[PDB]
Design a protein around this motif. Sequence first.
Motif, PDB file in Angstrom:
ATOM      1  N   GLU A  12       1.124   0.895  10.242  1.00 22.04           N
ATOM      2  CA  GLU A  12       0.133   0.123   9.473  1.00 22.04           C
ATOM      3  C   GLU A  12      -1.033  -0.344  10.354  1.00 22.04           C
ATOM      4  O   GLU A  12      -0.894  -1.293  11.155  1.00 22.04           O
ATOM      5  CB  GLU A  12       0.749  -1.069   8.727  1.00 22.04           C
ATOM      6  CG  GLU A  12       1.767  -0.690   7.658  1.00 22.04           C
ATOM      7  CD  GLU A  12       1.125   0.032   6.490  1.00 22.04           C
ATOM      8  OE1 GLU A  12       0.139  -0.515   5.957  1.00 22.04           O
ATOM      9  OE2 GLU A  12       1.592   1.144   6.121  1.00 22.04           O
ATOM     10  N   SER A  13      -2.177   0.326  10.167  1.00 22.91           N
ATOM     11  CA  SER A  13      -3.357   0.167  11.009  1.00 22.91           C
ATOM     12  C   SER A  13      -3.883  -1.267  11.097  1.00 22.91           C
ATOM     13  O   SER A  13      -4.326  -1.703  12.172  1.00 22.91           O
ATOM     14  CB  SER A  13      -4.470   1.113  10.549  1.00 22.91           C
ATOM     15  OG  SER A  13      -5.030   0.703   9.317  1.00 22.91           O
ATOM     16  N   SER A  14      -3.835  -2.004   9.987  1.00 24.39           N
ATOM     17  CA  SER A  14      -4.247  -3.406  10.033  1.00 24.39           C
ATOM     18  C   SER A  14      -3.305  -4.223  10.937  1.00 24.39           C
ATOM     19  O   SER A  14      -3.765  -5.028  11.748  1.00 24.39           O
ATOM     20  CB  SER A  14      -4.368  -4.022   8.624  1.00 24.39           C
ATOM     21  OG  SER A  14      -3.107  -4.274   8.012  1.00 24.39           O
TER      22      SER A  14
ATOM     23  N   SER B 100      -7.493  11.103   8.369  1.00 28.35           N
ATOM     24  CA  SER B 100      -7.165   9.725   7.982  1.00 28.35           C
ATOM     25  C   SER B 100      -8.210   8.648   8.330  1.00 28.35           C
ATOM     26  O   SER B 100      -8.617   8.504   9.481  1.00 28.35           O
ATOM     27  CB  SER B 100      -5.817   9.306   8.564  1.00 28.35           C
ATOM     28  OG  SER B 100      -5.549   7.937   8.285  1.00 28.35           O
TER      29      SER B 100
ATOM     30  N   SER C 134       0.806  -1.217   0.000  1.00 22.87           N
ATOM     31  CA  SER C 134       0.000   0.000   0.000  1.00 22.87           C
ATOM     32  C   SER C 134       0.845   1.276   0.000  1.00 22.87           C
ATOM     33  O   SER C 134       0.344   2.351   0.332  1.00 22.87           O
ATOM     34  CB  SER C 134      -0.882   0.028   1.236  1.00 22.87           C
ATOM     35  OG  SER C 134      -0.089   0.312   2.385  1.00 22.87           O
TER      36      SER C 134
ATOM     37  N   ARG D 245      -7.125  -1.210   1.678  1.00 24.73           N
ATOM     38  CA  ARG D 245      -5.882  -0.482   1.794  1.00 24.73           C
ATOM     39  C   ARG D 245      -5.006  -0.507   0.536  1.00 24.73           C
ATOM     40  O   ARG D 245      -4.016   0.233   0.472  1.00 24.73           O
ATOM     41  CB  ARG D 245      -5.092  -1.050   2.968  1.00 24.73           C
ATOM     42  CG  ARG D 245      -5.646  -0.681   4.329  1.00 24.73           C
ATOM     43  CD  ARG D 245      -5.068  -1.537   5.438  1.00 24.73           C
ATOM     44  NE  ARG D 245      -5.536  -1.086   6.742  1.00 24.73           N
ATOM     45  CZ  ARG D 245      -6.777  -1.263   7.205  1.00 24.73           C
ATOM     46  NH1 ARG D 245      -7.696  -1.895   6.463  1.00 24.73           N
ATOM     47  NH2 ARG D 245      -7.101  -0.801   8.413  1.00 24.73           N
TER      48      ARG D 245
ATOM     49  N   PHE E 172      -7.488   5.686   8.288  1.00 27.65           N
ATOM     50  CA  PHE E 172      -6.711   4.602   8.853  1.00 27.65           C
ATOM     51  C   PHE E 172      -6.325   4.897  10.286  1.00 27.65           C
ATOM     52  O   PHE E 172      -6.226   3.986  11.107  1.00 27.65           O
ATOM     53  CB  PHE E 172      -5.490   4.316   7.978  1.00 27.65           C
ATOM     54  CG  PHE E 172      -5.849   3.992   6.558  1.00 27.65           C
ATOM     55  CD1 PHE E 172      -6.690   2.916   6.277  1.00 27.65           C
ATOM     56  CD2 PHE E 172      -5.380   4.776   5.506  1.00 27.65           C
ATOM     57  CE1 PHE E 172      -7.047   2.611   4.966  1.00 27.65           C
ATOM     58  CE2 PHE E 172      -5.727   4.487   4.192  1.00 27.65           C
ATOM     59  CZ  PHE E 172      -6.558   3.398   3.916  1.00 27.65           C
TER      60      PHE E 172
ATOM     61  N   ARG F 219       6.853   6.175   8.005  1.00 31.54           N
ATOM     62  CA  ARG F 219       6.565   7.611   7.984  1.00 31.54           C
ATOM     63  C   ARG F 219       5.136   7.913   7.541  1.00 31.54           C
ATOM     64  O   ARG F 219       4.886   8.863   6.798  1.00 31.54           O
ATOM     65  CB  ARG F 219       7.556   8.369   7.113  1.00 31.54           C
ATOM     66  CG  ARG F 219       9.016   8.185   7.520  1.00 31.54           C
ATOM     67  CD  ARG F 219       9.874   9.182   6.775  1.00 31.54           C
ATOM     68  NE  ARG F 219      11.044   8.574   6.169  1.00 31.54           N
ATOM     69  CZ  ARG F 219      11.762   9.147   5.208  1.00 31.54           C
ATOM     70  NH1 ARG F 219      11.413  10.334   4.732  1.00 31.54           N
ATOM     71  NH2 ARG F 219      12.824   8.526   4.714  1.00 31.54           N
ATOM     72  N   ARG F 220       4.202   7.088   7.994  1.00 34.18           N
ATOM     73  CA  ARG F 220       2.794   7.370   7.814  1.00 34.18           C
ATOM     74  C   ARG F 220       2.051   7.219   9.147  1.00 34.18           C
ATOM     75  O   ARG F 220       2.506   6.514  10.059  1.00 34.18           O
ATOM     76  CB  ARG F 220       2.209   6.453   6.746  1.00 34.18           C
ATOM     77  CG  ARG F 220       2.940   6.556   5.411  1.00 34.18           C
ATOM     78  CD  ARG F 220       2.102   5.993   4.274  1.00 34.18           C
ATOM     79  NE  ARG F 220       1.837   4.569   4.453  1.00 34.18           N
ATOM     80  CZ  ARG F 220       1.265   3.808   3.527  1.00 34.18           C
ATOM     81  NH1 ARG F 220       0.909   4.356   2.371  1.00 34.18           N
ATOM     82  NH2 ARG F 220       1.062   2.508   3.747  1.00 34.18           N
ATOM     83  N   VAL F 221       0.930   7.920   9.275  1.00 35.97           N
ATOM     84  CA  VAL F 221       0.057   7.736  10.423  1.00 35.97           C
ATOM     85  C   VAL F 221      -1.009   6.740   9.987  1.00 35.97           C
ATOM     86  O   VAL F 221      -1.349   6.682   8.805  1.00 35.97           O
ATOM     87  CB  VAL F 221      -0.594   9.065  10.865  1.00 35.97           C
ATOM     88  CG1 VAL F 221       0.437   9.994  11.505  1.00 35.97           C
ATOM     89  CG2 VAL F 221      -1.272   9.751   9.682  1.00 35.97           C
ATOM     90  N   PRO F 222      -1.526   5.927  10.921  1.00 35.64           N
ATOM     91  CA  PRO F 222      -1.199   5.829  12.349  1.00 35.64           C
ATOM     92  C   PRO F 222       0.083   5.048  12.668  1.00 35.64           C
ATOM     93  O   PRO F 222       0.569   4.233  11.877  1.00 35.64           O
ATOM     94  CB  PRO F 222      -2.389   5.049  12.902  1.00 35.64           C
ATOM     95  CG  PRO F 222      -2.718   4.115  11.759  1.00 35.64           C
ATOM     96  CD  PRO F 222      -2.615   5.003  10.555  1.00 35.64           C
TER      97      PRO F 222
ATOM     98  N   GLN G 214       5.909  14.227   9.137  1.00 34.95           N
ATOM     99  CA  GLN G 214       6.180  12.788   9.114  1.00 34.95           C
ATOM    100  C   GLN G 214       7.608  12.491   8.617  1.00 34.95           C
ATOM    101  O   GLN G 214       7.961  11.336   8.347  1.00 34.95           O
ATOM    102  CB  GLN G 214       5.142  12.025   8.274  1.00 34.95           C
ATOM    103  CG  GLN G 214       5.195  12.304   6.759  1.00 34.95           C
ATOM    104  CD  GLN G 214       4.315  13.487   6.342  1.00 34.95           C
ATOM    105  OE1 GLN G 214       4.103  14.438   7.111  1.00 34.95           O
ATOM    106  NE2 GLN G 214       3.785  13.422   5.123  1.00 34.95           N
TER     107      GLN G 214
HETATM  108  N1  LIG Z   1      -1.928   0.988   4.856  1.00 31.01           N
HETATM  109  C1  LIG Z   1      -1.673   2.103   5.741  1.00 31.01           C
HETATM  110  C2  LIG Z   1      -1.989   3.434   5.109  1.00 31.01           C
HETATM  111  C3  LIG Z   1      -1.509   4.553   6.046  1.00 31.01           C
HETATM  112  C4  LIG Z   1      -1.635   5.911   5.329  1.00 31.01           C
HETATM  113  O1  LIG Z   1      -1.873   5.951   4.128  1.00 31.01           O
HETATM  114  N2  LIG Z   1      -1.482   7.154   6.088  1.00 31.01           N
HETATM  115  C5  LIG Z   1      -1.598   8.454   5.466  1.00 31.01           C
HETATM  116  C6  LIG Z   1      -2.625   9.293   6.170  1.00 31.01           C
HETATM  117  S1  LIG Z   1      -3.829   9.834   4.982  1.00 31.01           S
HETATM  118  C7  LIG Z   1      -0.292   9.184   5.544  1.00 31.01           C
HETATM  119  O2  LIG Z   1       0.452   9.044   6.497  1.00 31.01           O
HETATM  120  N3  LIG Z   1       0.108  10.083   4.488  1.00 31.01           N
HETATM  121  C8  LIG Z   1       1.386  10.754   4.621  1.00 31.01           C
HETATM  122  C9  LIG Z   1       2.304  10.173   3.585  1.00 31.01           C
HETATM  123  O3  LIG Z   1       2.064   9.028   3.105  1.00 31.01           O
HETATM  124  O4  LIG Z   1       3.306  10.837   3.189  1.00 31.01           O
HETATM  125  C10 LIG Z   1      -2.330   1.944   7.085  1.00 31.01           C
HETATM  126  O5  LIG Z   1      -3.387   1.265   7.234  1.00 31.01           O
HETATM  127  O6  LIG Z   1      -1.789   2.493   8.084  1.00 31.01           O
END
Ligand SMILES: N[C@@H](CCC(=O)N[C@@H](CS)C(=O)NCC(=O)O)C(=O)O
Lengths: 184, 187
Positions: free
Chosen positions: B64-66, B15, A100, B103, B17, B50-53, B43
């Motif tokens: 990775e929320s899952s 988000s 993803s 996802r 997620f 480097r993604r939330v959560p 981030q």
């Molecule tokens: N598969 C991931 C997707 C997480 C995700 O896409 N987070 C977004 C929030 S909209 C994010 O951090 N975007 C900042 C970036 O990717 O640079 C999950 O379930 O945690």
Amino acid sequence: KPITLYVGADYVSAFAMSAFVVLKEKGLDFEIRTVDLKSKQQSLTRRVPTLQHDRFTLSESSAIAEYLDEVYPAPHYAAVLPADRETRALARQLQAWIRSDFMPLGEAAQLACEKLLSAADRLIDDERYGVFGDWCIADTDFALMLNRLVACGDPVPPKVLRYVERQWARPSVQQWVKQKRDAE
Amino acid sequence: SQKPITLYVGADYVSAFAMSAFVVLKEKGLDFEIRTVDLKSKQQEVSLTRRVPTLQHDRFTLSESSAIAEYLDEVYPAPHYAAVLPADRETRALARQLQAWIRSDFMPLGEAAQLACEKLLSAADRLIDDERYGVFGDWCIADTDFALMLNRLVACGDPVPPKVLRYVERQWARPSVQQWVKQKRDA
Ligand SMILES: N[C@@H](CCC(=O)N[C@@H](CS)C(=O)NCC(=O)O)C(=O)O
Ligand SMILES: N[C@@H](CCC(=O)N[C@@H](CS)C(=O)NCC(=O)O)C(=O)O
């Protein structure tokens, strides 16, 4: 139980390889059926791979590995996921991340590269066969994804190159490449 | 006393997620602090991706929320705690499938958009029934995820069966999700 693995006609999906590797690393028997994309896939999601376990069917290679690990658990079968609870968490993160993110693989592209490289550098080490010690299915996924470093712009540490080589050399992965060659 | 828990979310509480992980914690009745991450472009320490959560459980950090849902379900399992994943092995595999699908598909949300719209509506029509509260019966975290995703049907061009409107409404009404719109609101 009769297993059928639905796979891309051209054998190029990293996620179809994933599922294939799981079945191989476990030593399970299975038929392969092929779905000629362009555009015969139109399985709930209408994507490959799709697993057929007797009457039960299942798409998403990550779910597929999760399910075959439960139905065919260690010790009697090889575990494709780690045994330690938080190492299991980390392999799940790695699987879901790979599936993803890194879509650009340019500002966006440069950023994916920088995250992929940074992760390779922090997760891989010469002392460990996989990123978490023993091979788990996430290692095969990570190796496949790391092949995209070739298109990026920053110097790749040799430890990463060795990891990708080590993981591609697995017999399970090699049967996949032979399966692909037999056409024709 | 349970291990300390922290949740990293986007500062905008947008988000889908972030909300998912928050819902898992809340369903199980666990204590946690919430910390926020801005954009642009904070981030970029506690998060490999480097993604939330991202979850911090005592000392352990996990994105990775899952993967978070799977992990909280193992550390705080039924029957001592409410489960966010189905007990039935086949049904568990289906929720895992739904989470991953959500996802990793539906990016276009055009012609690729048209296809994603179609696939979304067809899944909704097949999995949602008025006789079942969640897609599998009992609620699981997959339902929150599904309900969030189904809100993209509004941008499509096919008529939506009211049975899925109801599902979405049902799922947004859980006290756990509501806690999220309440925490968000307070900002
Ligand atoms: N598969 C991931 C997707 C997480 C995700 O896409 N987070 C977004 C929030 S909209 C994010 O951090 N975007 C900042 C970036 O990717 O640079 C999950 O379930 O945690
Ligand atoms: N996250 C999924 C990925 C599945 C996937 O992306 N399949 C591709 C393989 S090329 C596909 O079926 N593309 C055809 C389509 O989506 O129409 C998994 O691991 O199974």
